[PDB]
Amino acid sequence: VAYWRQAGLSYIRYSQICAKAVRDALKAEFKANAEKTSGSNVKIVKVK
Amino acid sequence: QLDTSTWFITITSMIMTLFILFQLKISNYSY
Amino acid sequence: QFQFTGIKKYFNSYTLTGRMNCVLATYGGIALLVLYFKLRSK
Amino acid sequence: QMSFTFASPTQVFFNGANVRQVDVPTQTGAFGILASHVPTLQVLRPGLVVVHAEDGTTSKYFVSSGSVTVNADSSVQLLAEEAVTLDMLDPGVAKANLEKAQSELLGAADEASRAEIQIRIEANEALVKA
Amino acid sequence: NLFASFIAPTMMGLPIVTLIIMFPSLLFPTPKRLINNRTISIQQWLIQLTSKQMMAIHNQKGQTWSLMLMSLIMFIGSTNILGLLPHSFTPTTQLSMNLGMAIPLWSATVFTGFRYKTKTSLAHFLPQGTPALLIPMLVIIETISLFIQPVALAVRLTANITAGHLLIHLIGGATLALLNINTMTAFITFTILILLTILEFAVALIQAYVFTLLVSLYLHD
Amino acid sequence: IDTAAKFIGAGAATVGVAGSGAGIGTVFGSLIIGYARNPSLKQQLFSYAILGFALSEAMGLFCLMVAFLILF
Amino acid sequence: IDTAAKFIGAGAATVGVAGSGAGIGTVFGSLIIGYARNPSLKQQLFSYAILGFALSEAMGLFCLMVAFLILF
Amino acid sequence: IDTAAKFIGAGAATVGVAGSGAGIGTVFGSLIIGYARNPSLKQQLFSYAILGFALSEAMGLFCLMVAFLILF
Amino acid sequence: IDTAAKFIGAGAATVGVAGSGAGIGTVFGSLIIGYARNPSLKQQLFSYAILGFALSEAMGLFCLMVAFLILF
Amino acid sequence: IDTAAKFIGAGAATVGVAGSGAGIGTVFGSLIIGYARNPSLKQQLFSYAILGFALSEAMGLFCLMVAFLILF
Amino acid sequence: IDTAAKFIGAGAATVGVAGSGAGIGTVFGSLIIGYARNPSLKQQLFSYAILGFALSEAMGLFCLMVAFLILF
Amino acid sequence: IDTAAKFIGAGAATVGVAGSGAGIGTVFGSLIIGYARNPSLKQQLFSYAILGFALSEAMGLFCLMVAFLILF
Amino acid sequence: IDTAAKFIGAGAATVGVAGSGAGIGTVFGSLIIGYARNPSLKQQLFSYAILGFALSEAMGLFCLMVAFLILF
């Protein structure tokens, strides 16, 4: 148990945050990997 | 000091109080 | 009087084993007798 | 006496390669893997992983998160969400991000959002070391 | 001098040890209505809270002993706390009643175990599982270990309270003497600091005394 | 004749407090490491620590009683 | 003089009880860290702790009994 | 004068049993932590524990016997 | 013959403070390793360490006070 | 006289056995924890245990021989 | 006789350095394993170690002071 | 009769080396455990190990020196 | 008279050798738990221990030699 746990954060959420933080630090020349990641292409439709 | 061979009264009184007074008062409880 | 009937069940039911105070009485009597002998010896 | 596979969702670095040892900065302290290590299963934390080749050279990579698995034999699978090299990084932008993340702590109101901010500052402070 | 309070069975023309030892019972009024005042509600809540934490192990026969154990713990705890008063006389200091408390219950447990479960009660001497080939050596170890329980159970209670009171009295004498020579409030600071520990050290002893007997009873039940 | 023997016997007997000090040091030391495992249940482990310290103190306190007995 | 020898021997005899404190401190220190690791097997852990505390007390009280016997 | 020598020799030799308590505390503590990891293997762990406890208590008993011999 | 004999008795009662010199080391040592795995929660750890150190040193001051009393 | 010297020397020398007991305790404690962690390595683990036990017992036997020499 | 009864308390008062040595050994040892767990937190570890060693040695030197002051 | 005091005082002050002998083992023991988990940083672990050993041996040498001074 | 003091001092000097016996068990104990992990890395582990055992026994022997020196 760490501070992120018992705070409403899951391991997947923490992995997303750390991966985003690492990808930010890259040089502007190599920033084309944001196109490769592009994690936002799935919409959510609930039952109601 | 604690060993003066007058141990009859204390034992009798302790037995009396422990085995009569406290059990009877503690029995009248609800939970 | 009116208190025996309150815990009569306890006394005749479960404290049968705990009612063996003979060991304590014998030990106390022996200790007192030895102390009396020592005091009388002076 | 080892089969090391350092894979990523995009590319592959090793596939069954034999190396003498690998050092991993996992959770709950550091680690060292050699010969027939005892079986273990642990997740990673942002840090630097070094692999010592049979010749003697040391290759370095930066890992964000993933999983580690050492099985009964000398087979190790290290699957990481991220795998990058320092040569494509800017230390200055790292320091700027850290500087902003510092004030983000006091900017936060609720403990969950501040927990996210704390993860941010933890990642930023971890990477600026090297 | 120092050994004055201990060797003093309530000095009077007629001994009044009975009055001193029966006094604590006049602090627990018995309930008589569905809703009562504040002073007894706390008592019954405390009794309920303590009961569910200790007697929740025995299956059916140990539930019968519940009243005796609660009475015992309340009695010892009430006797010990009242002794912190400036000129009180703690009956638990005397070894006589401590010796008259341990033996009956221990004997009750030990020959209750043999009456119903003689086959298993005889087996507990030999440790469970195979202890290599050292059987005769450890057989004589655990049987002598059996007899020491009441002696220690009485002696620790007889010793710790006397040690605490001796410390308090000596520190008080020390802080009195240093008034004439120089000025030092460090000693009264020591006294006030130690008083917290002496105040909270009694209830731990009550709990340990009751818990050991609980464990011993559960073994043969 | 006897005063010197009683005083030196009391002075020798008063060295039994080392074990209690070591025990209480050990127990509290284990508590901090155990707490660090998971911040939850801190009150339970604290209760265990307090019980252990009190038990060690009881097991080591009756040494000084013999010293006071020999003194008086 | 013989009584003085008995007194000094009794005073020097009690110093062996310090072993009980260290053993008690160690056994209890293990229970907390072990429980913290696996908060499932409370009963077996406590039974083993109680067994250890019961067995460890024998030596110190034995030495104290020897001192009491030699003094009187 | 010989009785004084016997008394002081007995009072000095009785100290050697102190180490038995520490060893007993050590072995029992190890069993607690050991059981936490592999409760399945609790059968084999005891045999080791008993062996150690018996060995340490035997050493303590040997020292006590030497003390009794020097007393008599 | 009196003050000279009390000199050794008072000097031999200042060994109990040595046992207080190990519990403190064990306590602070546990603090170092305990927080090493959990870098946060420093304040509560520090408070617990301080409590343990104070308790052990008070146990030592007990023996020191007994030694002070023996002289006079 | 010589007899009192022999008695005191024999009594003081025979106390160097606590170290052996403490050593035996630690060795067995490590063995159970070690096997508990990594099974299927009993040969080496048992091997190291024996060596340690033999070393500690020899260390104690040296002091026993010293006591024998002092007495005679 | 006064000189004869002196220098024996002084000799018995210098045996109190054992606990300080044990504690000074225990602290530095805990630092080694702690450092190996997490190399990042080094300066704080070293500060804690230094504080612990200084406090332990300060506690230990009290016995030497008492022995010297009794000696002269 | 002062020579007897010198001899027994020197004999009593010799017991001060137990702490160093017990402390030495924990440092070297801790080193083996720390090296096993992280072999790479083999160089740094030593400086601390040898620092602790030097401190412990100095603490023992102090008691040796005071015993020699008393004996001469 | 001086001969009796010589015997008493020689007997009392050997007490301090208990430190080595305590440390050997801890040293070999570390080897068992250390070998439990990364077993193949064994040569360096054994080397480290040998040094600790040698140093502990050297300290023990250094303590002992004063007994023979004072005896003759």
From Swiss-Prot, chain B:
List the cysteine pairs that form cystine.
Answer: none
Q: Which organism is it from?
A: Sus scrofa (Pig)
Q: Which residues of the full protein are shown?
A: 3 to 33 of 67
The subcellular location is: Mitochondrion membrane
**Name of the protein this chain belongs to:** ATP synthase F(0) complex subunit 8
Physiological role: Subunit 8, of the mitochondrial membrane ATP synthase complex (F(1)F(0) ATP synthase or Complex V) that produces ATP from ADP in the presence of a proton gradient across the membrane which is generated by electron transport complexes of the respiratory chain. ATP synthase complex consist of a soluble F(1) head domain - the catalytic core - and a membrane F(1) domain - the membrane proton channel. These two domains are linked by a central stalk rotating inside the F(1) region and a stationary peripheral stalk.
Gene from which the chain derives: MT-ATP8
Q: Which residues cross the membrane?
A: 6-22
Q: Which domain of life is it from?
A: Eukaryota
Subunit composition and interactions: Component of the ATP synthase complex composed at least of ATP5F1A/subunit alpha, ATP5F1B/subunit beta, ATP5MC1/subunit c (homooctomer), MT-ATP6/subunit a, MT-ATP8/subunit 8, ATP5ME/subunit e, ATP5MF/subunit f, ATP5MG/subunit g, ATP5MK/subunit k, ATP5MJ/subunit j, ATP5F1C/subunit gamma, ATP5F1D/subunit delta, ATP5F1E/subunit epsilon, ATP5PF/subunit F6, ATP5PB/subunit b, ATP5PD/subunit d, ATP5PO/subunit OSCP.
Q: Where is the signal peptide?
A: none
Q: Which residues form a coiled coil?
A: none
Homology family: Belongs to the ATPase protein 8 family.
UniProtKB/Swiss-Prot annotation, chain E:
Give an example GO cellular component term for this record. Answer: proton-transporting ATP synthase complex
Report the SUPFAM superfamilies cross-referenced here: F1F0 ATP synthase subunit A
Ranges annotated as spanning the membrane: 3-23, 65-85, 94-114, 133-153, 161-181, 186-206
Q: Which Gene3D superfamilies match?
A: ATP synthase, F0 complex, subunit A (1.20.120.220)
Topology versus the membrane, per the UniProt entry? Answer: Multi-pass membrane protein
- List the catalytic activities from the record: H(+)(in) = H(+)(out)
What would you give as a GO molecular function for this chain, any one?
proton channel activity
Q: Give the principal location in a single coarse category.
A: mitochondrion
Task: Report whether Iron shows up as a keyword of the record.
Answer: no
- Tell me one GO biological process term: proton transmembrane transport
Compartments, as annotated in UniProt? Mitochondrion inner membrane
> Which InterPro entries does its entry note?
ATP_synth_F0_asu, ATP_synth_F0_asu_AS, ATP_synth_F0_asu_bact/mt, F0_ATP_A_sf
* Keyword entries, A-Z: ATP synthesis, CF(0), Hydrogen ion transport, Ion transport, Membrane, Mitochondrion, Mitochondrion inner membrane, Transmembrane, Transmembrane helix, Transport
PANTHER family named among the record's database cross-references? ATP SYNTHASE SUBUNIT A
Subunit-structure text: Component of the ATP synthase complex composed at least of ATP5F1A/subunit alpha, ATP5F1B/subunit beta, ATP5MC1/subunit c (homooctomer), MT-ATP6/subunit a, MT-ATP8/subunit 8, ATP5ME/subunit e, ATP5MF/subunit f, ATP5MG/subunit g, ATP5MK/subunit k, ATP5MJ/subunit j, ATP5F1C/subunit gamma, ATP5F1D/subunit delta, ATP5F1E/subunit epsilon, ATP5PF/subunit F6, ATP5PB/subunit b, ATP5PD/subunit d, ATP5PO/subunit OSCP.
Q: Report the sequence similarity comment from the record.
A: Belongs to the ATPase A chain family.
- Purpose: Subunit a, of the mitochondrial membrane ATP synthase complex (F(1)F(0) ATP synthase or Complex V) that produces ATP from ADP in the presence of a proton gradient across the membrane which is generated by electron transport complexes of the respiratory chain. ATP synthase complex consist of a soluble F(1) head domain - the catalytic core - and a membrane F(1) domain - the membrane proton channel. These two domains are linked by a central stalk rotating inside the F(1) region and a stationary peripheral stalk.
Name under which the protein is recorded: ATP synthase F(0) complex subunit a
UniProt source species: Sus scrofa (Pig)
Taxonomic lineage:
Eukaryota, Metazoa, Chordata, Craniata, Vertebrata
